[PDB]
Amino acid sequence: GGEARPRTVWLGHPEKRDQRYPRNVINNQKYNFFTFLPGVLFNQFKYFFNLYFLLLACSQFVPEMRLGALYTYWVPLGFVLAVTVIREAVEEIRCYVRDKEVNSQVYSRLTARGTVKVKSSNIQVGDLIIVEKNQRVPADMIFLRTSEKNGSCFLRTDQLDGETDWKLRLPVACTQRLPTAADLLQIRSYVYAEEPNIDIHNFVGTFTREDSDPPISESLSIENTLWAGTVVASGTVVGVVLYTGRELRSVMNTSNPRSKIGLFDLEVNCLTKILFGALVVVSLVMVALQHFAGRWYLQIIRFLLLFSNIIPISLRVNLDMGKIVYSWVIRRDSKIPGTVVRSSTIPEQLGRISYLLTDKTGTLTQNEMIFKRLHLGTVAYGLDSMDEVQSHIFSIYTQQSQRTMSSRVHEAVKAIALCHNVTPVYESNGVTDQAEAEKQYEDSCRVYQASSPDEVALVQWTESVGLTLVGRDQSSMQLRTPGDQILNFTILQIFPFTYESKRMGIIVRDESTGEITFYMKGADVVMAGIVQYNDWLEEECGNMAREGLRVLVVAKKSLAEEQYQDFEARYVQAKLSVHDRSLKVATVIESLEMEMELLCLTGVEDQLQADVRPTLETLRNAGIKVWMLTGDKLETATCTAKNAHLVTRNQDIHVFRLVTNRGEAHLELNAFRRKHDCALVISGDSLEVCLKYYEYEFMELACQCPAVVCCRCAPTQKAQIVRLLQERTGKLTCAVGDGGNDVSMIQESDCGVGVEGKEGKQASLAADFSITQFKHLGRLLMVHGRNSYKRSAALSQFVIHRSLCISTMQAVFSSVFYFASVPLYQGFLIIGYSTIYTMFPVFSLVLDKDVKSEVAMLYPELYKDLLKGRPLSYKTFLIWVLISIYQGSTIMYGALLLFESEFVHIVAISFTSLILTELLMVALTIQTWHWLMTVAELLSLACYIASLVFLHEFIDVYFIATLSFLWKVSVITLVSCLPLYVLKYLRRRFSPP
Ligand SMILES: CC(C)CCC[C@@H](C)[C@H]1CC[C@H]2[C@@H]3CC=C4C[C@@H](O)CC[C@]4(C)[C@H]3CC[C@]12C
Ligand SMILES: [Mg+2]
């Protein structure tokens, strides 16, 4: 609408504004009230197929042009227009209703008279909206105040950038210290926010409070921002709205909704142009035959109007009803429940997808992490062997009051239970207060919260074996044992996990003994040299990683009361430095990071969704290349790629390093080129450089890959990847996602599928097809797409064949029977009127199937045939053209040569022969017979016999009730259809499908 400018947002009072802000509404609609009709009309009549009808109809306005009745040109086109408008309108009402659930969420705001309850749509910039726990943040906000005593909160941004880690967000310091939540309305404070941009992980702002005698100014960053679409993980937060509606950071990354057309529709449109060009060519030949006879422009276009039915409106009507039937079938399948079809005009696109691009967090995975393996070197403990770890812990803490394997197991478990950054949170269950449960350490009211879900999984696992961690402070940590006694540990040093070191350490003192213990856990690559000599770390960690687990190496070092003093004195000496602090403390910690005894290796798995591995294997077996485009980190993405068998166990993986320029990109691209049959894992930062500088080479190397993993992808980068896959290959692409970061690539893709997320519905609402589970994709692609594509191709080709046969024989009639007469047009309106009796058996091809639904799924290789364009091609169309020409020529020439008396004794023969030939041809193309096709074929014959009976009494047509009629009809019906019967049977025999 307007240029982006920084905004001064006053806390409360949503009226001190200079620019009007958009309403906070998420809209997936295509058109508004005003632009609905023009948009639909243009999107319909922008193609040759639909514009042909308009060109035909408009000509009826020139008096020297008029041919036929006026109501025959506009009633069918009017029906087509009215069905298209109705379909689009109903789609719009359904989209608006589906958007209402998100746009009508209930929240609360702070007013001078007290809190009041308002909806999500009415949220204005500058409003103080209260967001509770496990509630989606409605609009972009600034963290002001939280009800938690530690002055912070955790955010789940899985629906914003697809990252599984929880984001720790800190409130505004000035607003946090106010005595009550009602105090922010009596302070003259404002937030100066940057212009709404597409970046989601950055924010530059400033908080200013003018009320205080010393003005207080805070510099705001991403750590104070609660973007829309995120979920508050803990506590009740209060924020000030900065952006609304389109201005939301989620919406800037969302493209405008577009109307999609399938490739099958484009091929049919090209066939219509070919037909019209052939008509024009024969027109130029026919006029040039007479060496120009004056007013040629009149006669040639009059003859065009005479053959105007070579492109039938029945084609468009049949395709529309077939697509409606396909959508009705998809919405009613019980083996893929919950499937929703939004774009009901492209069900045939599911049958020609060559590339599938999917999100990891929430689509492939369940967004749940649990502990899988505890490897102690000499023995591993799986999910079925945890009762021995529990037994060892119980035995030790029973023998405490009443080396060995139990001691080693306990030492390995306690290190996991202490070397972490997880803090318990206690809530009031309703009977016991929050302060009531803390002093007794209630199990039902205790929740573990941390930035890394792996640490939460480890803590929850140690809870299961007996060592329950019940409290944690900045200098203390309590563990609860099976003997119900509590051990008190004092946290003397903590080294938080960093993505560069890839390790986390801690130093604790056991108050019962006083011994100093140093714990360190991290990746195997960094802990290979820290731990002492061993012979199983590099092998067992590699095996556990190859199984798809997140391996960690846990180590120990017992510190005496003398090795700690010199370490503390040097650590603080490094800390109170004014020159190169980081490298100073790094050396102090590294000096302690020596000769650590190895305890155990841990395996934590991100729980996939149901039937993800079989679905990926099914899609791989059908020639579909599956790329995982995720916004998560490299390690989690690789672990999920290995877990889901997106890469085979023996497959080699090349990790794309961090490249920053053109020269650095040449070397890495070439080095990857020297590899063979190796999957590619690339970060977003390297992808940006490769796509900016090496657009051709990167994709010519990535399309040959068995699979491609691209982590930390911005939504624009995902959409760009989809766009290049569409452009440089020319093959259809499918995009699967569950969050708001997948909407861009879902809309960009030729067929976008949106998995309904657990905490968000944007991808579901903005996709052509919405599924509840990832495993439904296999059926949706192998059955509901293949059947729709095949049925649409068959019915379109049969309709074209019928019209071509009618036109060919009716051209023979007008040429070799009279060559000039008014009574020609009475016959030249009726022998093309047969399509009232054969219309039902033509609308019975939407019930046809080549193989059973359980056979396409069990043999996905049938899809590789559709990937080649078999159902509709130039060879099949040419064969149908030859068949139609042969049938028309045979019917008319045989009718004329066998017997020739006058017009009304040949019209009857030709009409019945054409109807019977078309019915037989309908019966010819069927592969598996359905009873509705049988009833349609029988009802057609019954109606034709009824018509030939009623007219017999009124019109003297006694020719029908003779023997000379029967053999004359049945010889043409035998020489027109049955030669193709023989050909089809011999095709079955010699070349089975
Ligand atoms: C008079 C003609 C042109 C039209 C009406 C007859 C048609 C609809 C009839 C005649 C013979 C019939 C077939 C005869 C036998 C079987 C085997 C069984 O699995 C049921 C379907 C199937 C395959 C029938 C399908 C319908 C069928 C093809
Ligand atoms: Mg996701």
Swiss-Prot record:
Name of the protein in its database record: Probable phospholipid-transporting ATPase IIA
Subunit: Heterotrimer with MON2 and DOP1B; this complex regulates SNX3-retromer mediated endosomal sorting of WLS. Interacts with RAB5A and RAB11A.
Keyword Glycoprotein: no
Transmembrane segments: 38-59, 65-87, 272-293, 301-322, 795-815, 828-846, 877-895, 903-925, 932-952, 960-983
Role summary: Plays a role in regulating membrane trafficking of cargo proteins, namely endosome to plasma membrane recycling, probably acting through RAB5 and RAB11 activation. Also involved in endosome to trans-Golgi network retrograde transport. In complex with MON2 and DOP1B, regulates SNX3 retromer-mediated endosomal sorting of WLS, a transporter of Wnt morphogens in developing tissues. Participates in the formation of endosomal carriers that direct WLS trafficking back to Golgi, away from lysosomal degradation.
Catalytic reaction(s) noted: ATP + H2O + phospholipidSide 1 = ADP + phosphate + phospholipidSide 2
Amino acids binding ATP: 359-361, 455, 497, 502, 521, 550, 630-632, 712, 718, 741-742
Disease: Neurodevelopmental disorder with poor growth and behavioral abnormalities: An autosomal recessive disorder characterized by global developmental delay, impaired intellectual development, absent speech, and behavioral abnormalities, including hyperactivity and attention deficit disorder. Affected individuals show failure to thrive with poor overall growth, and some have microcephaly. Additional features may include non-specific facial dysmorphism, hypotonia, and feeding difficulties.
Stretches assigned to the Extracellular side: 60-64, 294-300, 816-827, 896-902, 953-959
Cytoplasmic side: 88-271, 323-794, 847-876, 926-931
Cofactor: Mg(2+)
Cell compartments where the protein resides: Early endosome membrane; Recycling endosome membrane; Late endosome membrane; Golgi apparatus, trans-Golgi network membrane
Membrane topology: Multi-pass membrane protein
UniProt keyword terms in alphabetical order: Acetylation, ATP-binding, Cell membrane, Disease variant, Endosome, Golgi apparatus, Intellectual disability, Lipid transport, Magnesium, Membrane, Metal-binding, Nucleotide-binding, Translocase, Transmembrane, Transmembrane helix, Transport
Single GO term (MF): magnesium ion binding
EC number(s) on file: 7.6.2.1
Family: Belongs to the cation transport ATPase (P-type) (TC 3.A.3) family. Type IV subfamily.
CC per GO annotation: early endosome; early endosome membrane; endosome; late endosome; late endosome membrane; perinuclear region of cytoplasm; plasma membrane; recycling endosome
PANTHER family (UniProt xref): PHOSPHOLIPID-TRANSPORTING ATPASE IIA-RELATED, PROBABLE PHOSPHOLIPID-TRANSPORTING ATPASE
Binding residues annotated for Mg(2+), in chain numbering: D359, T361, D738, D742
Active site per the UniProt annotation: D359
Cited InterPro entries: ATPase_P-typ_cyto_dom_N (IPR023299), ATPase_P-typ_P_site (IPR018303), ATPase_P-typ_TM_dom_sf (IPR023298), ATPase_P-typ_transduc_dom_A_sf (IPR008250), HAD-like_sf (IPR036412), HAD_sf (IPR023214), P-type_ATPase_IV (IPR006539), P-type_ATPase_N (IPR032631)
Record GO biological process: endocytosis; negative regulation of exosomal secretion; neuron projection morphogenesis; phospholipid translocation; regulation of endocytic recycling; regulation of retrograde transport, endosome to Golgi; retrograde vesicle-mediated transport, Golgi to endoplasmic reticulum
